[PDB]
Amino acid sequence: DIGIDNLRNFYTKKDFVDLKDVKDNDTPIANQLQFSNESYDLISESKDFNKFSNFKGKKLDVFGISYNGQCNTKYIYGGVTATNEYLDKSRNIPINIWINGNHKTISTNKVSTNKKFVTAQEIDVKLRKYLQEEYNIYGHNGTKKGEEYGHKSKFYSGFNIGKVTFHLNNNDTFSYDLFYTGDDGLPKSFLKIYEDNKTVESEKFHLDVDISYKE
Ligand SMILES: [Zn+2]
């Protein structure tokens, strides 16, 4: 299943997109923003055409996972925020985690943001990299961390079921499946979850994470 190696690589090894104060190119394309550098163009795709219209030609930040495009292009789903408000300090997002039923609470510099409104993508990708580093959820993390959970899953890990829930202060929520591989195991499919360019107010949410196994 190609999705095993692609989740591991795209979430936990491949460098995230992280652009600050970059100008969108203001093309006529309604569903795409575009950011150029000397070697390639990054195209962000979204279904939030109203947001994209407001962002055309503006100074923006971009964060998330890109995947290769033809010739001189790379793609990301969403990932875009307005460069107008930032917190004074990065906020480490509190994480309530249940690991095979056992609960703990943690915060870490590894899951943090200074954006007043952060994409869900930025937080999720940071979180999954942290979960891989500490719990080896996708297997083959290259350290001894998470050996205690074993290697029974198809990832060579202790886990094959999991969820991240964004828990907003008003007890609205939304969730992503930590082991979703899309229709074909390819990033162009599984990253499409981020195409809404959903954001959250960084000071006013926390994360609930559940990871477990069923044979
Ligand atoms: Zn909660």
Which of 99, 98, 208, 105 has the alpha carbon at shortest distance from 164?
208
For residue 206, the CA-to-ligand 1 centroid distance in Å is 6
The answer to whether 3 touches 187, Cβ cutoff 8 Å, is no
What are the angstrom distances between the C-alpha of 22 and each of 46, 51, 67, 136, 165? 18, 16, 19, 34, 30
For residue 173, the CA-to-ligand 1 centroid distance in Å is 9
For residue 195, the CA-to-ligand 1 centroid distance in Å is 24
Task: Compute the Cα dihedral for 125, 179, 34, 60 and give only its sign.
Answer: negative
Tokens of 150: 């074993």
* Helical ranges in 113-162 per DSSP H: 120-135
The answer to whether 31 touches 41, Cβ cutoff 8 Å, is no
Tokens of 175: 């969730």
**156-132-174-206 Cα dihedral, nearest 10 degrees:** 150
The answer to whether 134 touches 99, Cβ cutoff 8 Å, is no
Tokens of 34: 């575009």
Dihedrals φ, ψ of 192, to 5°? -65, -15
Amino acid at 108: T
For residue 14, the CA-to-ligand 1 centroid distance in Å is 29
For residue 97, the CA-to-ligand 1 centroid distance in Å is 9
Q: Which residue has the tokens 């943690």?
A: 106
Distance, in Å, from the CA atom of 183 to the CA atom of 119, rounded to the nearest integer, reads: 24
Distance, in Å, from the CA atom of 163 to the CA atom of 176, rounded to the nearest integer, reads: 6
Rg of the chain on CA atoms, in Å:
17
Write down all domains in the chain, each with its CATH number in brackets: 1-14+85-215 (3.10.20.120), 15-84 (2.40.50.110)
What are the angstrom distances between the C-alpha of 9 and each of 89, 102, 140, 185, 186? 30, 27, 10, 12, 11
For residue 32, the CA-to-ligand 1 centroid distance in Å is 33
Which string of DSSP letters, residue by residue, matches 69-84? -STTEEEEES-EEETT
For residue 170, the CA-to-ligand 1 centroid distance in Å is 11
Beta-carbon contacts of 189 under 8 Å, excluding residues fewer than 6 positions away, are 181, 182, 183
For residue 91, the CA-to-ligand 1 centroid distance in Å is 17
Distance, in Å, from the CA atom of 176 to the CA atom of 180, rounded to the nearest integer, reads: 8
Beta-carbon contacts of 89 under 8 Å, excluding residues fewer than 6 positions away, are 114
- Please count the residues of the chain: 215
Q: What was the elucidation method?
A: X-ray
For residue 107, the CA-to-ligand 1 centroid distance in Å is 13
* Helical ranges in 37-106 per DSSP H: 49-55
Task: Compute the Cα dihedral for 131, 133, 138, 139 and give only its sign.
Answer: negative
